[PDB]
UniProtKB/Swiss-Prot annotation, chains A, B:
This is Toll-like receptor 8. The lineage of its organism: Eukaryota, Metazoa, Chordata, Craniata, Vertebrata. Changing G504D: In IMD98; gain-of-function variant resulting in increased NF-kappa-B activation measured in a reporter assay. The chain holds residues 31 to 818 of 1041 of the full protein. Keywords: Disease variant, Disulfide bond, Endosome, Glycoprotein, Immunity, Inflammatory response, Innate immunity, Leucine-rich repeat, Membrane, Receptor, Repeat, Signal, Transmembrane, Transmembrane helix, Ubl conjugation. It is a single-pass type I membrane protein.
Length: 750, 750
């Protein structure tokens, strides 16, 4: 039987049951399911009958029920003897639920209203490994200080991760187990760390003390400093027996002085986070740095002195002792000029590959200095002032910075990367890139550049392979633009509409043909509608063209023949994106002039009232056809005559009200047909009557206004007989009529 | 009886019947209707019965039927003895329809397939005043040269306007009537104008010869030059008896020489259009200019020499004879520098108020020169390179330029206007605005400006009253910004999100309180989510704040109290726009802190699941409440208790499925209720049972999924009894169920 209301799969056997507007635990969950995701529903009661039929359950996710809190009886879960992981986040629970199964290894109660951690709630959960209680009382929420019963955690002798961040604690809890590997005490209003607080935790590898005595100036949240904005006070012997520490987080602890003796017995420390402190003085002196010869990542971001814009950054000679350093983050220091000598102390560090100076309002850099480093791989300078050379917070993320790569992994994969995005290099003059390493990945996005590139600007870094020029005002008025970069493989010119949008200025895209290695070109959002002299794009190498957000409705206007072969000269093209081009119809001859090598064609989010399915005959390699978001009415009845390659056909958000006799099971090759959000009232006997067989494995139908009379029987019957063809989200495959069926699944009817 | 399918009104009595998917002329049009708009439908046949019941018809509009052309029998209109205006544009008519009523004064057949203008079609329409036949054969359309029967127009002795633009004619037609005031022959492929062509047209006030021998380089359409790109050839005596000419259009006629003798007998010429020619030489010499002392508007745009970027513009001394000149357009000449002396010849012209140098790639201007003009009002410099001081075409519009004002009328209404938008004044230094007139309207939009304004930058033009700073990268980091402009009434800071989006930099909006005359402030699209030190906006004058496209979901996050009074200090505010702020709910206390002076509140296009209607009690002046585009489910049953001011309530695009008993006719004051595109299945007896009376005059209901059973009877009955309450577009107030009603109007059912 086709499972309902959950979607299932085998991975442990997972029941996807999230976000289906369920009002209670469905009683119809499969008895082989090991993992049950019921998150984001409208469930209000959990009782001992809620999971009665499901003792193979090892993982239950009830996060965010309902969307006025979640009501859980004493020992509602007690009979699930195999339950290991119970997620109850964001449920407005007033208490730890009573009578939780002793088999629990993972319990998350993040984002609730729990101000009392009790022996009765917890001390019997002796198998706990990971306990999350964070974000229960914080900011300006109306809540109580957290009462932690003396010794509530001491019985949990296999506990490896304890998180109590974003609660009011005032003190580190006594009687923590020595099994701890990771202790999260961020934003807990603890002012003082004594010798006793951590003395027993010889297995700790991570300690997070960030946000206690925070630095509150310009904070993007409600922020309460320690009296007189004082530092956190950490006893000299506080970290004495923390010999296995790898991660230390002291962001926003208002630190002015770092005690070198803190690091004495921490030979393995790998990642040290010191953001949002007052360490300008310490960065210039930094005795503690001599204690950290294994440190790989040091984050000193946002240590700026309120109100100062000094000329230069001052880095201690002691940075030269950070022998293992791989990345240094120095965002938000704030300074005017970077000179070669200012970074002398970093230049011999053999593994320093990332230097991050984002958001420093830097006006001038002595570029030649970077090449004197051993080998930088990522020279991140985004969001400065370089100019021509002359609940709101994700509880499961990092709070103090974004976790994403600095440079797009696709670009950094080519080699050495320089990101000068979000500056003011509004004009690249003859000497701008002198004395740089062999840059492979260059980001010049959002530099207000309005120049006419002409074939010489990048001559001093001629091996750039991935060039990001997005979001400038580039004037493409010279056929030699960018031709100096003969290794260029990826070129992104997105959002340079400034001059293209003006009909009366000239526009030249002829340089595209000059590249022998160009694979991917992005011309998106350029409002391209007129070119000068040469009307066609030509490349013998190009594999992918993104032409979304242009004016193909104008270029292919029925009265104009000039752009009828605009893409034909792209002899190697396999992927073409023509979304967002306002197209009502594509002239037959223009469609036939698309590259016959295409395997993937997107024409989604236009206004197509017409598609000539017959022309698919000229595309024997076409596998994916994306026509989502149009106004199409008519499906051909003879698709198998027109293609034997097409594997995925996407037609959601159209106006199809009729599937033709023997439509699906038209093409052997068709695996995925998406017909969601169309105007289907019914699917007939004959529309699926084609046999045999179907390679069809997915058919999406949600969002159609189905008429649920006996006329739905043949499709319902079809569904039972083709359990191999997955129909997702049956909860949303809904009857629009008649009145008494309105709102029900089509699957729920006699 | 409530009219259907057309909407009616009294103005002549107009039946709005356009764009309703009508498949034929409805037989149910009211017999008092004088004007019938049936444009943009799917009508395919017009016969003699089509209007049988409607002899009061003076105006019929059939433009764009259908959306495979329009089929019109011989004399289908002949019985409409009062028909004066017949619009048949865009209908794919192969011929002038036969047997048109002799009462016609206006006939438009623009955008058809008519290549034959015949005596049989036309010569009897002796009352014609305006005849439009333009855009039948043009560009790369597959079409025939136009055959104009000898003397087909000579019988039409009251013809005042003839348009044959965008057809292939090759020759000016002989035997035109001398009644002509306006003759449009643009893009007609006429190469030669002889002495005879116009000799009889002594009433002509406008002649359009543009686009014959066009200048084709970089044209945004299919463009065919005259042999060897030669000029149009105009006989010396071609304009000899055109003594009443006011308008002359010779754009894109490939002119290199203007014959002064052409203007000899044209003492009234007012507007002369010479765009897209080759007149750089003529502009530097220009004997013809001495012949035009009454000319008010001269357009010499786009006369650039292909490939040249000269240093300076060269204006003949003879420009000083254009005594009447009011506006001079010199876009697209192309030059580097503007010096004081280059415009000497314009400086004594007493009425020259507009100078337009858009799109010249000008790098440097000697600003002091403008003040030496008699009185410029509009100094338009948009789209240059100034930097810190050191069917596609609308047939009813102008083809060669846009018709809209150069400067927004709201800004130009304050006084002298300087538009420096779309340049590169990326930093306003101490001297940038020295030696300018008293500028009231300043446009600095899209200059890539990333400076920290600080209270001195505009000191040399301190009486700016309307300042457009949109689309820059402004760093609002100083509380004194803009305070030098103490007369400022309108300030537009839209699309300056660059720094606001960065949490870790400081942000200051305190300057807002410093203005005693500030009326309108636009902070749209700034991604505002965090401010430094001061969390509130304060002004004792501000009447209108646009805060759309910001992050009030973040500012008003339930755990943060800091922005709970963000708008309260706007003591004078009557209009507040909080659209596009991602709001799920507004905290009660934040809503109550909105200015009590509001008369107009927009919270449309958010994600509101909740609205506290009770809080409307604190807004006794509130008249318009806009909550369109949300996810609201719940309408209060007691609105009259909460407001007696509200006149317009907009709730389209929500999820309302229930109107409460005695809802509408809740508030006496409510005139306009918009409930379109919600989830109403029915409207009950009791929902409208409130009596008496209703000031309700509009109720929008289209787009609801109405259940058309007998349960719709009470509303249908209600509609008959309240003919005063207009329900628009009944065609689109449609039954969703049951099956046999699906698609019908609710008004069409037993
Ligand atoms: C103070 O500084 C320390 C750094 O020393 C920070 O510690 C990190 O805290 C974050 C957030 O709380 C932790 O990140 C989360 O880790 C979860 C577990 O990851 C482990 O398991 C996976 C495989 O399951 C491994 O790949 C991984 O390396 C670990 O072994 C992840 O499951 C989380 O990801 C999930 O949620 C995020 C939500 O955004 C999604 O983006 C993910 O795609 C996925 O759904 C998340 O990555 C992190 O592990 C901690 N570091 C360490 C070393 O333990 C503190 O956060 C910082 N304090 C503050 C307040 O900022
Ligand atoms: C060569 O140069 C001449 C200028 O000398 C141009 O002539 C103009 O041509 C345009 C477009 O064809 C005409 O503009 C249209 O005029 C219609 C009639 O306007 C009269 O009536 C109204 C009141 O009814 C008065 O306000 C007005 O001043 C006139 O008395 C308008 O109805 C049109 O507007 C309608 O359509 C446009 C479509 O975009 C809408 O925007 C409007 O809101 C409205 O729906 C339109 O304004 C213009 O009148 C001609 N000028 C003269 C003086 O006659 C040629 O166009 C140019 N040739 C080419 C090819 O560019
Ligand atoms: C311009 O278009 C280019 C090319 O399409 C865009 O880059 C491409 O972005 C897509 C995602 O939009 C990347 O694909 C994704 O990559 C990840 C990682 O492998 C994968 O998990 C996803 O399933 C998906 O495949 C693709 O790699 C990337 N290609 C390149 C060459 O970088 C680019 O983002 C566009 N520019 C702008 C401003 O939108
Ligand atoms: C920033 O918001 C300002 C103020 O709301 C915007 O200006 C205003 O724009 C509206 C139209 O959006 C103008 O109202 C319209 O004016 C015409 C002419 O009277 C009228 O026909 C319309 O019915 C409507 O009233 C309004 O006058 C104008 N106000 C001012 C002071 O200029 C401005 O456009 C916004 N900026 C951006 C970039 O969106
Ligand atoms: C070039 O720099 C721009 C701006 O820093 C990067 O744009 C960011 O891209 C990421 C992922 O694509 C988005 O999450 C950010 O929102 C973007 N930021 C902005 C301000 O646009 C771009 O990714 C960088 N290019 C490369 C190749 O790494
Ligand atoms: C300031 O200059 C900008 C750019 O020229 C003007 O923006 C144009 O505004 C009109 C009507 O608002 C739109 O039709 C155009 O699309 C806009 N163009 C662009 C490129 O944004 C703006 O209107 C000018 N400001 C004033 C006060 O006149
Ligand atoms: C990481 C940034 C921290 C705070 C900050 N915000 C800004 C900002 N929005 N614009 C600036 C522009 C130039 C220099 C510094 C800042 C700045 N800064 C540093 C700063 C330096 C100096 C002053 C004025 N005394 C104010 C601010
Ligand atoms: C009204 C404009 C007409 C054609 C044009 N288009 C452009 C353009 N896209 N960028 C320019 C940038 C600087 C100078 C001139 C142009 C230019 N120009 C003028 C121009 C001048 C000079 C040259 C190169 N010989 C090419 C083009
Ligand atoms: C949970 O349900 C029980 C009904 O047995 C009730 O007594 C209790 O008040 C409920 N909790 C909430 C928050 O309503
Ligand atoms: C480096 O640290 C040592 C402690 O080992 C300290 O005494 C010295 O002054 C530091 N160097 C500088 C330049 O401050
Ligand atoms: C630098 O990195 C490599 C790992 O690729 C490691 O073998 C080497 O020991 C490192 N050198 C230092 C000083 O840490
Ligand atoms: C492009 O500019 C270069 C250098 O500025 C110039 O030599 C050349 O004439 C231009 N190229 C073309 C094809 O116009
Ligand atoms: C680019 O290619 C074209 C045509 O193949 C050639 O004429 C041109 O000189 C090339 N330009 C450069 C700068 O390599
Ligand atoms: C065509 O694309 C493939 C895949 O990128 C590449 O191997 C080949 O070199 C390209 N062909 C040409 C002629 O550039
Ligand atoms: C589809 O394309 C073929 C080839 O251009 C043409 O013969 C046929 O008429 C087209 N069909 C439609 C409906 O336009
Ligand atoms: C118009 O209708 C008549 C039917 O009387 C038919 O003869 C004629 O062919 C029709 N025109 C078109 C274009 O179909
Ligand atoms: C101005 O026009 C006259 C004709 O009246 C002509 O002879 C004279 O040369 C022109 N002036 C200039 C500077 O060319
Ligand atoms: C200038 O404009 C005014 C109209 O306001 C008019 O009275 C005056 O005669 C004009 N002067 C000339 C030389 O045309
Ligand atoms: C703003 O800048 C001005 C001039 O640059 C400076 O005097 C002042 O200190 C700044 N104002 C504030 C309020 O910080
Ligand atoms: C602006 O107003 C504030 C408060 O009313 C005042 O303190 C400040 O000095 C004013 N600034 C200027 C530049 O007028
Ligand atoms: C309030 O607004 C009105 C209308 O703009 C204006 O007349 C009045 O001057 C403003 N009040 C104050 C105190 O600025
Ligand atoms: C609506 O507002 C009033 C005043 O804040 C409050 O008493 C009431 O509880 C609110 N209603 C809802 C449904 O939140």
């Amino acid at each position: 039987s086709r499972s309902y209301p959950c979607d299932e799969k085998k991975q442990s056997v997972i029941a996807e049951c999230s976000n289906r507007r369920l009002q209670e635990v469905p009683q119809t969950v499969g008895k082989y399911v090991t993992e049950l995701d019921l998150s984001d529903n409208f469930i209000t009661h959990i009782t001992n009958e809620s999971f009665q039929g499901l003792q193979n359950l090892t993982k239950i996710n009830l996060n965010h029920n309902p969307n006025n809190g979640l009501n859980i009886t004493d020992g509602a879960f007690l009979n699930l003897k195999n339950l290991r992981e119970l997620l109850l986040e964001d449920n407005q629970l007033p208490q730890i639920p009573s009578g939780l199964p002793e088999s629990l290894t993972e319990l998350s109660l993040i984002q609730n209203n729990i101000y009392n951690i009790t022996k009765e709630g917890i001390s019997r959960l002796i198998n706990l490994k990971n306990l999350y209680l964070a974000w229960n009382c914080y900011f300006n929420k109306v809540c109580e200080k957290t009462n932690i019963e003396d010794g509530v955690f001491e019985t949990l002798t296999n506990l490896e991760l304890l998180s109590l961040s974003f609660n009011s604690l005032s003190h580190v809890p006594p009687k923590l187990p020595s099994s701890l590997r990771k202790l999260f005490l961020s934003n807990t209003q603890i002012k003082y760390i004594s010798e006793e607080d951590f003395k027993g935790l010889i297995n700790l590898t991570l300690l997070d003390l960030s946000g206690n005595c925070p630095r509150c100036f310009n904070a993007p949240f409600p922020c309460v400093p320690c009296d007189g904005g004082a530092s956190i006070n950490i006893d000299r012997f506080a970290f004495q027996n923390l010999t296995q520490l790898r991660y230390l987080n002291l962001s926003s602890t208002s630190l002015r002085k770092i005690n070198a003796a803190w690091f004495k017995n921490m030979p393995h420390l790998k990642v040290l986070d010191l953001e949002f402190n007052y360490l300008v003085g310490e960065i210039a002196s930094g005795a503690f740095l001599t204690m950290l010869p294994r440190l790989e990542i040091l984050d000193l971001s946002f240590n700026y002195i309120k109100g100062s814009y000094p000329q230069h950054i001052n880095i201690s000679r002691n940075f030269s002792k950070l022998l293992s350093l791989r990345a240094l983050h120095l965002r938000g220091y704030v300074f005017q000029e970077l000179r070669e000598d200012d970074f002398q102390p970093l230049m011999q560090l053999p593994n320093l590959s990332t230097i991050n100076l984002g958001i420093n309002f830097i006006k001038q850099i002595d570029f030649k200095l970077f090449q004197n480093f051993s080998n930088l791989e990522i020279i991140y300078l985004s969001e400065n002032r370089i100019s021509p050379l002359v609940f709101e917070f994700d509880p499961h993320s990092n709070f103090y910075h974004f976790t994403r790569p600095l440079i797009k992994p696709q670009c950094a994969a080519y080699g050495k990367a320089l990101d000068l995005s979000l500056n003011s290099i509004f004009f690249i003059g003859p000497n701008q890139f002198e004395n740089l390493p062999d840059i492979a990945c260059l980001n010049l996005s959002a530099n207000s550049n309005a120049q006419v590139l002409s074939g010489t600007e990048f001559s001093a870094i001629p091996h750039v392979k991935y060039l990001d020029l997005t979001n400038n005002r580039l004037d493409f008025d010279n056929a030699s633009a960018l031709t100096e970069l003969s290794d260029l493989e990826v070129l992104d010119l997105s959002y340079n509409s400034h001059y293209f949008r003006i009909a009366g200025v000239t526009h030249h895209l002829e340089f595209i043909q000059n590249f022998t290695n160009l694979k991917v070109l992005n011309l998106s959002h350029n409002n391209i509608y007129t070119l000068t002299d040469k009307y066609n794009l030509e490349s013998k190498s190009l594999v992918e063209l993104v032409f979304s957000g242009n004016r193909l409705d104008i270029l292919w206007n029925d009265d104009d023949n000039r752009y009828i072969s605009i893409f034909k000269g792209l002899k190697n093209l396999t992927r073409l994106d023509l979304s967002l081009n306002r197209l009502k119809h594509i002239p037959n001859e223009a469609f036939l002039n698309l590259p016959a090598s295409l395997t993937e064609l997107h024409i989604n989010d236009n206004m197509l009232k017409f598609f000539n399915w017959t022309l698919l005959q000229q595309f024997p390699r076409l596998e994916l056809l994306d026509l989502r978001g149009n106004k199409l009415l008519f499906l051909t009845d003879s698709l198998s005559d027109f293609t034997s390659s097409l594997r995925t056909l996407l037609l959601s958000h159209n106006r199809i009200s009729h599937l033709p006799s023997g439509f699906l099971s038209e093409v052997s090759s068709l695996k995925h047909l998406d017909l969601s959000s169309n105007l289907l009232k019914t699917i007939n006997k004959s529309a699926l009557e084609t046999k045999t067989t179907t390679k069809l494995s997915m058919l999406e139908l949600h969002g159609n206004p189905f008429e649920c009379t006996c006329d739905i029987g043949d499709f319902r019957r079809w569904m039972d007989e083709h359990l191999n063809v997955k129909i997702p989200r049956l909860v949303d495959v809904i009857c629009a009529s008649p009145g008494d069926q309105r709102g029900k699944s089509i699957v729920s009817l006699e």
